[PDB]
């Protein structure tokens, strides 16, 4: 049968200082035992001084990343340029999965 | 389906079919309510188009909406209908869901919120009833007394009338209730009711009924009679030179 | 709209073409192996970038759409003309015949005469192409109705136009070149510009030739647009 | 695209009438007459065959059109609208009935069920009542022979005999006077024929006139043997031949 | 602004103002077709009239094939007869795969009816300003002629005629068939068929043909074809030498 | 297993209905009510499907209840069952079925009976002297089927019960935690409150 | 022959004039004035913004659309919020499906298809706004104007709304002058204010009266208002 | 369905106008029956009177209506009235009380004047009927959508007329047989014919069944109303 | 007299100038927008004596940071609180954090906007424009104490001070003369109160007016009699040595 899923591999690192904070990935992509990719970055800049890694499925990881950066860009369009602050990206970012909960 | 627009505003800002719904009520029997010290007390009329009627059977003005508060109307008794049954469902969906039966002032906004919708839906008209909603909250014993008209507006009264010559029995009911000393009794309540319905019925004959709300759940029809007791102690007594 | 007059005739379909009349003068010329189409572009205000506000629509890869009305009623038929034209190669394999393209637009359009809730089209469109067998030319008007021709003009300069294809079908029975409609297409808006001066205009022409364009429709740019307004102005002075 | 006159095209106008109903009655007045006549074994529907230009094929043009094997109609009016009238007719006495129960309707059923598509038609949205008022003429088991007209309105009512159209006045008199309950078949053909020579204009034959019976069963008319319990269809329509023979002994 | 004067609704005396309008519209295009059967065949002849000299007079035309067996030949206005003309190809083509046989004559010609008389009663759906005659020669029926107008009315014909001189040309074919007893023309060519039809069209119409003024149809067993200017040239030199 | 039984004497209906619920190794409550009042005379007891249970039971309650108050009028138990049956044989068949099995226990005024009405959640409807659904049938039924007599009083009724609650408790292997027992007759509906410390 | 002839848009009069259009079109000439002018490098629109009363807002008349694109409005101000939200989906469609900024050009297209289908459809109304169109793509910058008609035109420069004659005539002639304005954007500004100024019975506009936007080169669509905007009064 | 300046209801009014001209029916409420009396509009020698119906409508075993207005009409709402008494047996397997099914056949009327754009109804009705809540009840609807309980009342053509009379010779302590009686008398005096003849009629009783203790529906044949005729003085 | 949304020849839409005069006839909400709050009053107006005044509900709370006053007819506004309430409550849910006053307001005027038959969208479910003004009031972190008047235009203006109702065209120009950026807001209190008394068809007392305010830091509170009649004999009093 069709399996929707695959596995790129790929570790990502979050460490948050005083005034701070860092994201970090391997630029290693993977599939079963071989190299897709040496430099295939997934730890994305989405503006807002927010910066994202979804790791595991990459086909999953872009669509997630590509709807956050235009959730940043719809809620800078419909509340009046205002800056999302982490929290309210974090909140969000949890509808974007519960979403697809099943 | 069909949608064509029949509320529609006019130039000087009225909606002319809302308008025509009001007329209907005024068009429609009296119903009074006027709220005591611990009771509220609803009263209604009724025509002479003929006199071979069949009373068992024949729908009271006075609905029960769930056991402890009721719903009196003027105008169109096939429009009310409709809002009784739905009113009806909302109360027992509130309990199933809240644990808890309506507040009078809920169901108040229910019904008048279905009647406001009636004046905004393309292909609908308004309902040509106005409601007077009366009884106690669960667990309280404070009196409620509320009246929704087509346009879907609604409010809290002390006492009030709806329907043909209410403008007469308002005028009554302003000179009559005292707010520092509301009716005291189930029984100068009563009294203060079947007054302010005499000058428009005429004879207490086949036409004059009441019913009384108490606390929890509590509410009585009167019979013929009973109302006779105070049509012959008023017409008697306040008579006098 | 659904609506017969008394005498037979669509009284909306027939203020349609009044909207037709009143719009900017186009033609279409069939030659020995294609068609040319041609558009008065008024110049509103100088201000209008020229060459940059374009008229002619093409279908698929090989037809060209002209039309004059209302410019949105024309932009709407070809959005229509181009689903029409994926659907059959979808289908069909084969890029669509300009016959049978023409009853796809000319059922949509005739279907917009049926019915009271919408009003006909505010256009008369001009178009046609090369396909495998022969160049083609048709108008089609509000009413749904379309013929081909060997030329073909609307708009407010229709009559002074007409009269001009008129005159190169009896002197040119056998038949002219895509080089030379091109040119004769250049003059015949020149000519129709005479029912239409108080304004400035743009000319815009385009064509569709086996020889000459290997039966894609292209645009008449540069040299060949210029030498084609020569000729043009020549035969005006 | 799509329906926009969702409400009904026939209103009660202050007097009470409905218009578009009433008109619709006038439409079956200026109609070519047809009749129906009920006898004790069977009952006669005719019409007559208004041709127009005798280069026109009048045997193409039914007029009397078999429902069920049982049951027949005939209209005046509107042509056209018979025609789609008869074909749901036909379809609904399968759907309703057939496929439920497994045998034809009885016909005041069938008559419940055209009544119901003409009444339907004056009370939808965006539609105008059938221009025709029906006569069906149909037997079942357990009722016999019976006939029925059908109004624009979708009102229906059973008759001994009657007559609707152009001479519907004039006709509906002779019967009248020419009805009693003991008549035979052939004795009804032959009222009908005479009813209907009143109405015609020009010629007055076989080729201009259609008539149809609900008599007995024709086995012949069936197609098939080996199955005792039908003895096939009581629907006949006259042929130009037979319709001939009994003018010439009238 | 009467309504019964605008939407298919009854007016006072029980009329129905669009399909009289839809009537009028058949006439519009000015032109007189006829038909007839022969033997073993069924000719169509319709007045061609190319006006404008800009037109490319092989796209003008009225007559039509539907399918293989049925042709189709309208009287009203091009956009209407076009929109009947793509319906009945669909109906002809959706009838053979649900039914296994080709769509006979009459049947497409009944069910145009229909759905013209459902317009007649539907308020959104304005009539077809059309006159459809249909022929073939049926498997079953042989040379037929039906013929349907917007009012949903259809029936079958001996021979038929319409347009603007409908009833000159009806009473004159009226006239032959009255003396030669039969209802059909006794000719065992086609080609004799055609050269009858436009002779009686002539008579009738007080006018001579050139090739360019006329279009014919022939429907034969299993085809229907339209003849070509040159086909029609050789019909028309062949009454010369005759009449 | 959930132990639903009734019990119908000669002037009522006795309901009885265990008080544990259990979500696999604990037992959260000890005092469960697994019942309804649908109207002042008729009564429901259900057992069942965890969630579905209750909102079964909630959702018939506010149906009679409603058209208790539509029409000034109370509805019998007969008509009552035949409307819990109806729901539940249109349930088995769709989507995601109500498994949901109840005991009917009323007094019909009109007629002076009382009317016990077994129905599984298949929509199985049918008139007892005396039922049970689950496991607790298996017992029960043969102990009433001896012990039962027609003609009882109410008193004798709670003695039957206490001998079919005491045989459930020495033979069944879960600990249900006693029984709620009610009584349904002309006056209504009234709980024993003290069945268990007996 | 005016009469019943302007009920709705789905009927034509006797002239052939769609007059449900043509009001709409009315709209916008008692809206307030907005200007726009483009060069090689650059494209300016400068809106007036118009206040109800002293104490209120002048209610802004400039919708961002994209990184590389926007418009001015003039007329019904909700009308421009249901467009100018079409082309922020269009032009984000453009560049999630096809990592491509949408041409202004074909943001034109797509407005004026929009627009006619609303001049076509029984119980609908035409927009009731006029918009201008800048953007900078790949083939430089662009100014465009759209009319509720579904008439869209490009543009080196125009104006629309009340009085906008003045404005539109001051830009015919100051052409070869404000389409040489390259890689200066702050004397295109300058620019397309004075030609509002043509314009102005009015007042002299003030801090809160004014309102500019730029895209260009290297230069994301940025609106100014108040405080930033008093450097070109 | 819209309004007018007075709040009137346009349609309604106009489809009672519409019932005002249809043949009289009228109902009289006994201590031990229902008696249903209607006349049909002016008729013909050769209308079948035998398989013939139009005024008089069984809607279930227990239930009867008599019907002013436009027959077809009421053969729509007849056929849903019916169902809805079924739908009703089947739920609770008891039979539908008079009053519920009329409040719902009320409720469908009521709703062609208040959305839809349809035009109402053209009928109203004569509900006869027996239930173990009430007993023997007679009800009335018209397209308003409202309805009312009545000892005896008429609907159709002349109803003043036919009000008159009823008030005056009805008594609450009437058996059946006086009001088959009454409801002659009154169509009698009302008809807009000679005399009153057999074949002009239709007639039904709900009774108590002579001997069972169960509810009877008798539509009387065309010779029990010439029967009915004879002993009442009017042949 | 053809259509609903219809232009006129001016250019306007009928029903839209039509909902407006509705408005003028409803009773008088004012408005003052100050740097210590944002002040809402409004005229009770009952129409009998024997209606409890207090059971007029003409100013509500949307969320704890935005509250709302109305004018026109009162009915239509049941459903524009009721989706500004889900708007502020989901935005938060969303987000976690609170909706701004503009964006709210935005959303509010959006819901005005789906006025048509069957009118071409995406879709317009409604079949006129409402009748009912509302001044929308409320503080957030970015753009401070705001005031918003939203038509059933769908139009929104920001205001420092604005009336709608029947005494508006007073109001207004009253407003004008008093309004400047340092009102505080005890002194915005008491310039509602004297407004409402110049415009009222009864004498102002603590039952036929209600005053409210949003603080940022206590949120919307509605000011219950007492605490009005205070402010009431206080205004006759400031008003009496000047």
Same mark, same amino acid.
């Given at each position: ?102 | ?241 | ?237 | ?250 | ?243 | ?8 004497? *000669?002037? !009522?209906?006795?309901?009885?209905? &265990?008080? %544990?619920?259990?979500? $696999?190794?604990? /037992? ?8 309804? *009042?649908? !109207?002042?005379?008729?009564?429901? &007891?259900? %057992?069942?499907?965890? $969630?579905?249970? /209750? ?144 | ?233 | ?235 | ?242």
């Amino acid at each position: 049968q069709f399996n929707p899923y695959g596995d790129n591999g790929g570790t990502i690192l979050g460490i948050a200082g005083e005034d701070f904070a860092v994201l970090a990935g391997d630029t290693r992509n993977i599939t079963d035992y071989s190299i897709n990719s040496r430099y295939e970055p997934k730890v994305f800049d989405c503006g807002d001084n927010i910066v994202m890694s979804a790791n595991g499925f990459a086909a999953d990881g872009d669509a997630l990343v590509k709807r956050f950066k235009n959730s940043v860009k719809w809620y800078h369009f419909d509340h009046n340029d205002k800056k999302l602050s982490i929290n309210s990206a974090a909140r969000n970012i949890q509808h974007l999965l519960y979403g697809k909960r099943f | 389906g069909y949608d064509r627009a029949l509320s529609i505003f006019s130039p000087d800002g009225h909606i002319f079919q809302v308008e025509y719904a009001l007329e209907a009520v005024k068009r429609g029997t009296c119903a009074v309510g006027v709220k005591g010290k611990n009771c509220v007390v609803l009263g209604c009329e009724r025509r002479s188009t003929l006199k071979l009627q069949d009373t068992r059977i024949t729908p009271s003005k006075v609905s029960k909406i769930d056991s402890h508060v009721v719903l009196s109307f003027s105008g169109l008794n096939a429009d009310s209908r409709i809002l009784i049954e739905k009113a009806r469902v909302e109360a027992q969906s509130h309990r199933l869901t809240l644990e808890d039966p309506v507040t009078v002032e809920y169901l108040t906004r229910y019904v008048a919120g279905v009647q406001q919708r009636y004046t905004q839906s393309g292909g609908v008209r308004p309902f040509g009833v106005s409601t007077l909603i009366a009884g106690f909250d669960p667990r309280d014993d404070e009196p409620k007394l509320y009246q929704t008209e087509p346009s879907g507006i609604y409010s809290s009264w002390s006492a009030q009338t709806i329907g043909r010559n209410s403008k007469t029995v308002r005028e009554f009911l302003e000179k009559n209730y005292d707010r520092k000393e509301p009716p005291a009794t189930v029984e100068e309540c009563v009294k203060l009711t079947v007054r302010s319905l005499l000058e428009v019925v005429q004879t207490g004959a086949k036409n004059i009924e009441i019913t009384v709300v108490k606390p929890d759940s509590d509410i009585v029809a009167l019979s013929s009679e009973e109302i006779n007791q105070y049509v012959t102690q008023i017409e008697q007594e306040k008579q006098e030179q | 709209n659904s609506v017969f007059s008394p005498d037979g005739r669509n009284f909306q379909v027939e203020y349609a073409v009044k909207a037709v009349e009143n719009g900017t003068t186009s033609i279409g010329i069939k030659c020995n192996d294609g068609v040319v189409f041609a558009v008065e572009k008024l110049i509103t205000s100088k201000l209008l970038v020229p060459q940059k506000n374009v008229k002619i629509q093409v279908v698929d890869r090989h037809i060209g759409c002209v039309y004059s009305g209302l410019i949105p009623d024309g932009r709407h038929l070809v959005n229509r003309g181009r689903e029409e034209a994926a659907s059959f190669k979808k289908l069909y394999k084969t890029p669509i015949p300009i016959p049978a393209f023409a009853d796809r637009l000319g059922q949509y359009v005739q279907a917009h005469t049926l019915y009271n809730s919408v009003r006909p089209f505010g256009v008369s469109t001009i178009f046609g192409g090369v396909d495998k067998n022969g160049a083609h030319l048709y108008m089609l008007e509000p009413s749904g109705s379309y013929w081909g021709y060997k030329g073909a003009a609307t708009g407010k300069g229709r009559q002074s136009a007409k009269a001009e294809l008129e005159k190169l079908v009896d002197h040119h029975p056998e038949g002219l070149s895509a080089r030379e409609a091109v040119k004769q297409a250049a003059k015949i808006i020149y000519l129709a510009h005479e029912d239409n001066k108080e304004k400035d205009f743009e000319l815009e022409i385009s064509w569709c030739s086996l020889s000459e364009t290997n039966g894609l429709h292209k645009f008449v740019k540069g040299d060949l647009l210029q030498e084609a307004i020569d000729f043009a102005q020549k035969e005006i002075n | 695209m799509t329906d926009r006159y969702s409400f009904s095209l026939t209103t009660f106008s202050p007097s009470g009438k409905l218009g578009q109903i009433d008109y619709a009655l006038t439409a079956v007045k200026q109609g070519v007459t047809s009749l129906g006549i009920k006898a004790t074994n069977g009952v006669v529907i005719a019409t007559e065959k208004k041709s127009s230009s005798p280069l026109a094929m009048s045997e193409t043009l039914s007029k009397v059109s078999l429902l069920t094997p049982d049951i027949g109609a005939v209209y005046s009016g509107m042509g056209p609208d018979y025609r789609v009238l008869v074909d749901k007719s036909r379809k609904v006495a399968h759907t309703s009935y057939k496929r439920i129960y497994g045998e034809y309707p009885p016909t005041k059923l069938l008559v419940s069920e055209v009544a119901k598509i003409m009444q339907e038609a004056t009370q939808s949205g965006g539609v105008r009542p059938f221009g025709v008022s029906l006569l069906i003429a149909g037997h079942d088991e357990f009722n016999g022979f019976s006939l029925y007209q059908v109004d624009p309105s979708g009102s229906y009512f059973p008759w001994k005999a009657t007559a609707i159209g152009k001479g519907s006045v004039a006709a509906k008199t002779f019967l009248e006077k020419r009805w009693n309950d003991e008549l035979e078949l052939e004795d009804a053909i032959h009222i009908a024929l005479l009813t209907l020579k009143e109405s015609v204009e020009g010629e007055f034959n076989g080729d201009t006139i259609e008539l149809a019976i609900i008599g007995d069963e024709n086995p012949d008319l069936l197609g098939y043997t080996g199955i005792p319990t039908d003895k096939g269809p009581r629907f006949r329509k006259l042929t130009s031949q037979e319709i001939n023979d009994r003018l010439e002994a009238l | 602004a009467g309504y019964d004067r605008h939407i298919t609704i009854f007016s006072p005396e029980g009329r129905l103002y669009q399909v009289e309008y839809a009537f009028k519209a058949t006439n519009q295009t000015n032109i007189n077709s006829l038909a007839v059967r022969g033997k073993d065949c069924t000719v169509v002849i319709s007045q061609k009239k190319v006006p404008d000299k800009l037109l490319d007079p092989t796209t003008v035309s009225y007559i039509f094939c539907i399918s293989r067996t049925i042709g189709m030949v309208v009287n009203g206005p091009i956009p209407d007869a076009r929109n009947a003309a793509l319906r009945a190809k669909a109906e002809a083509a959706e009838f053979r795969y649900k039914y296994g046989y080709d769509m006979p004559c009459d049947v497409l010609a009944k069910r145009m009816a229909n759905l013209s008389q459902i317009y007649t009663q539907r308020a959104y759906m304005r009539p077809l300003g059309v006159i459809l005659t249909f022929v073939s020669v049926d498997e079953e029926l042989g040379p037929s002629i039906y013929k349907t107008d917007p009012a949903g009315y259809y029936v079958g014909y001996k021979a038929t005629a319409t347009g603007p001189k409908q009833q000159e040309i009806t009473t004159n074919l009226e006239n032959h068939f009255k003396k030669s007893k039969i209802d059909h023309i006794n000719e065992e060519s086609w080609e004799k068929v055609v050269e009858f039809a436009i002779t009686h069209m002539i008579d009738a119409l007080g006018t001579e043909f050139s090739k360019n003024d006329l279009e014919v149809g022939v429907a034969t067993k299993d085809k229907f074809f339209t003849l070509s200017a040159e086909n029609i040239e050789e019909r028309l030199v062949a009454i010369a030498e005759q009449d | 297993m959930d132990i639903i039984l009734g019990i119908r004497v *000669q002037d !009522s209906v006795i309901l009885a209905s &265990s008080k %544990a619920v259990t979500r $696999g190794i604990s /037992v959260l409550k000890d005092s469960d009510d697994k019942t309804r *009042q649908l !109207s002042p005379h008729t009564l429901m &007891s259900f %057992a069942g499907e965890a $969630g579905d249970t /209750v909102q079964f039971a909630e959702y018939i309650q506010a149906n009679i209840q409603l058209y208790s108050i539509r029409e000034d009028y109370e509805l019998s138990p007969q008509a009552v069952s035949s409307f819990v049956r109806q729901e539940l044989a249109k349930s088995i068949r769709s989507r995601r079925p109500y498994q949901v099995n109840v005991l009917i226990g009323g007094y019909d005024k009109k007629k002076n009976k009382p009317e016990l009405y077994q129905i599984d959640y298949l929509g199985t409807k049918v008139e007892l002297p005396y039922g049970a659904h689950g496991y607790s049938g298996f017992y029960t039924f043969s102990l009433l089927d001896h012990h039962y007599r027609p003609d009882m009083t109410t008193e004798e009724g709670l003695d039957l019960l206490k001998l079919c609650v005491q045989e459930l408790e020495k033979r069944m292997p879960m600990d249900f935690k006693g029984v709620i027992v009610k009584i349904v007759d002309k006056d209504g509906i009234r709980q024993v409150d003290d069945f268990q410390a007996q | 022959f005016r009469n019943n002839y302007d009920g709705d848009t789905v009927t034509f009069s006797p002239t052939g004039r769609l007059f449900q259009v043509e009001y709409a079109l009315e709209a916008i000439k008692q809206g307030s004035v907005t200007v726009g002018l483009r060069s090689n490098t650059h494209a300016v629109l400068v809106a007036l913004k118009r206040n109800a009363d002293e104490l209120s807002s002048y209610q802004k008349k400039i919708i961002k659309c994209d990184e590389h694109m926007g418009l001015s409005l003039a007329g019904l101000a909700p009308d421009a919020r249901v467009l100018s939200n079409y082309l922020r989906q269009q032009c984000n469609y453009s560049s999630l499906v096809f990592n491509r900024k949408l041409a202004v050009e074909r943001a034109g297209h797509l407005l004026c298809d929009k627009a006619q289908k609303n001049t076509q459809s029984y119980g609908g109304r035409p927009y009731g706004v006029g918009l201008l169109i800048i953007g900078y793509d790949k083939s430089g910058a662009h100014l465009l104007e759209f009319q509720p008609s579904g008439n869209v035109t490009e543009l080196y420069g125009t104006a629309i709304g009340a009085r906008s004659q003045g404005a539109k005539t001051y830009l015919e002639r100051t052409l070869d002058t404000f389409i040489k304005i390259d890689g200066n954007p702050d004397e295109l500004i300058k620019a397309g204010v004075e030609a509002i100024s043509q314009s102005l019975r009015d007042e002299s506009l003030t801090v809160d009266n004014l309102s500019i936007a730029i895209v260009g080169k290297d230069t994301p669509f940025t609106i100014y208002d108040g405080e930033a905007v008093a450097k070109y009064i | 369905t819209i309004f007018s300046p007075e709040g009137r209801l346009y349609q309604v009014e106009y489809a009672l106008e519409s019932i005002s001209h249809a043949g009289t029916a009228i109902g009289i409420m006994a201590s031990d029956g229902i008696v249903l009396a209607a006349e049909r509009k002016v008729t013909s020698t050769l209308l079948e009177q035998d398989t013939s119906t139009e005024k008089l409508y069984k809607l279930n075993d227990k239930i009867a209506v008599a019907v002013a207005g436009l027959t077809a009409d009421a053969e729509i709402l007849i056929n849903t009235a019916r169902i809805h008494a079924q739908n009703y047996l089947k739920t609770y397997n008891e039979d539908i009380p008079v009053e519920i099914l009329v409040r719902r056949l009320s409720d469908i009327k009521q709703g062609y004047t208040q959305h839809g754009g349809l035009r109402p109804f053209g009928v109203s009705f004569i509900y006869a009927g027996y239930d173990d809540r009430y007993g023997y009840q007679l009800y009335t609807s018209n397209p308003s959508g409202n309805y009312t309980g009545w000892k005896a009342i008429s609907v159709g053509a002349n109803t003043s007329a036919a009000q008159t009379l009823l008030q005056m010779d009805y008594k609450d302590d009437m058996k059946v047989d006086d009001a088959i009686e009454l409801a002659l008398k009154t169509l009698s005096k009302t008809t807009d014919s000679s005399a009153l003849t057999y074949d002009r009629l239709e007639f039904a009783t709900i009774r108590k069944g002579a001997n069972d203790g169960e509810v009877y529906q008798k539509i009387f044949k065309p010779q029990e109303i010439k029967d009915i005729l004879v002993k009442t003085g009017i042949t | 007299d053809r259509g609903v949304s219809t232009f006129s020849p001016e250019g306007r839409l009928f029903q839209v100038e039509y909902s407006l005069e509705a408005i003028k006839l409803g009773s008088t909400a004012i408005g003052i927008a100050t740097k210590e709050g944002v002040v809402l009053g409004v005229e009770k107006r009952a129409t009998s004596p024997l209606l409890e005044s207090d059971s007029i509900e003409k100013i509500v709370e949307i969320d704890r940071h935005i509250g709302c006053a109305m004018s026109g007819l009162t009915a239509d506004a049941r459903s524009m609180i009721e989706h500004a309430r889900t708007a502020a409550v989901t935005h938060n849910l969303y987000y976690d954090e609170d909706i701004n006053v503009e964006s709210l307001t935005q959303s509010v005027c959006d819901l005005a906007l789906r006025f048509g038959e069957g009118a071409s969208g995406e879709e317009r479910l409604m079949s006129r424009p409402f009748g009912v003004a509302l001044l929308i009031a409320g503080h957030d972190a970015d753009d401070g104490y705001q005031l918003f008047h939203a038509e059933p235009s769908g139009t929104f203006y920001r205001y420092n001070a604005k009336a709608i109702g029947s005494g508006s065209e007073g109001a207004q120009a009253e407003l004008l003369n008093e309004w400047h950026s340092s009102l505080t807001l005890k002194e915005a209190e008491l310039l509602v109160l004297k407004i409402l008394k110049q415009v009222m068809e009864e004498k102002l007392d603590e039952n036929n007016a209600q005053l409210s305010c949003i603080t940022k830091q206590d949120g919307f509170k509605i000011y219950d009699n007492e605490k009005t009649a205070e402010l009431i004999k206080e205004l006759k009093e400031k008003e009496a040595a000047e």
